[PDB]
Amino acid sequence: KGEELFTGVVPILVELDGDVNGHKFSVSGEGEGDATYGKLTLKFICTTGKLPVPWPTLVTTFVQCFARYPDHMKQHDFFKSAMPEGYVQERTIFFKDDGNYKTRAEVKFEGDTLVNRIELKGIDFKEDGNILGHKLEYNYNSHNVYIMADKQKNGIKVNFKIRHNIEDGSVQLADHYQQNTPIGDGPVLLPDNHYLSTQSALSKDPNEKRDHMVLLEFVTAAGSDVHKKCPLCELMFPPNYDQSKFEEHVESHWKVCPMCSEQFPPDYDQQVFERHVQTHF
């Protein structure tokens, strides 16, 4: 059915189970999404007491299938083309000078409803760092989500850097390493490299006493022809510069196998990467 599911308002459900440095918690979310606009509305409750991490840290984690792809780009919309069987979205999120989240989500239809079921593990976080110290402002900014085909899987590798504003006016960065791969064995769109321009606003229902977040998200697809910047680092490329070498550069941030050049999140814990390299010898 694919893009035909997304012509109107789709109801959304979200469930997450999380363990960050041993603090276990669960969140439930409900709302709806309108890919015609790229518009997405979602309210979250913490179902297990008071949330141990700040809500903004979870925003990316809580459905890029609701992006508006312009007509001239329908052919690059992986997200929607894997539906309704859906996809696995995995991420590692490196909070600079602090811990990281590792997430595994399945996003897919369950009847008429679009569901994001997530499990999330955080480790190595500082106790009075920006995350566990609750030092993030309750807000969000624009970002450009760079998207690449992983032809040799049958999905996408995705990269971007979130800017979380800190109550002392500094910024906490969070590098996102993301892969999406289809759940069904139907065929899917393998896109050319492009971006999703995302914008967000977090607010609060004033008649809600529980600890919650209301997230509004506006996502729409694109992708420039003079100066181009790297998604992860701030490296700036001169005007009109071999786009395959830009790509090469981005890949280089991933941990790369010297044999088959498969990419992995650049974790401190090499254990999983080390298992892969032994597959060749």
Q: Which residues bind a second copy (CB under 8 A)?
A: 36-39, 68, 135, 137-142, 144, 163, 165, 167-170, 197, 199-206, 216, 218, 220, 224, 226-229, 234, 236
- We find the least distance from the C-beta atom of residue 225 to a second copy, in angstroms, to be 9
Within 21-62, strands assigned E span: 23-34, 39-46
Nearest approach in angstroms of CB 212 to a second copy is 14
Per CB under 5 A, does 236 bind Zn ion? no
Angle, alpha carbons 144-56-29 (nearest 5°): 100
Q: How far apart are CA 95 and CA 92, in angstroms?
A: 10
Q: How far is the CB of 257 from Zn ion (least distance, A)?
A: 3
Residues 6+ apart with CB under 8 A from 10: 32, 33, 34, 35, 66, 112, 113, 114
Asked if residue 260 binds Zn ion (CB under 5 A), the reply is: yes
65 annotated ligand-binding residue:
no
3-state SS, residue 244: helix
3-class DSSP state for residue 277? helix
Interface with Zn ion (CB under 5 A), residue from 121, 262, 264, 266: 262
Candidates 270, 267, 190, 178; CA nearest to 231 is 178
Report which secondary-structure segment, H or E, holds 213. strand 212-222
Q: Provide, rounded to whole angstroms, the least separation between the CB of residue 73 and a second copy.
A: 13
The entry of Zn ion, a second copy, none that residue 224 binds, CB within 5 to 8 Å by partner kind: a second copy
Query: Facing residues of 50 across strands?
Result: none
Report whether 194 belongs to an annotated binding site.
Answer: no
Based on the shown chain and the rule CB under 5 A, indicate whether residue 173 belongs to the binding site for Zn ion.
no
Residues in contact with Zn ion by CB under 5 A are: 230, 232-233, 235, 257, 259-260, 262
Residue ranges of the binding site for Zn(2+): 230, 233, 249, 253, 257, 260, 276, 280
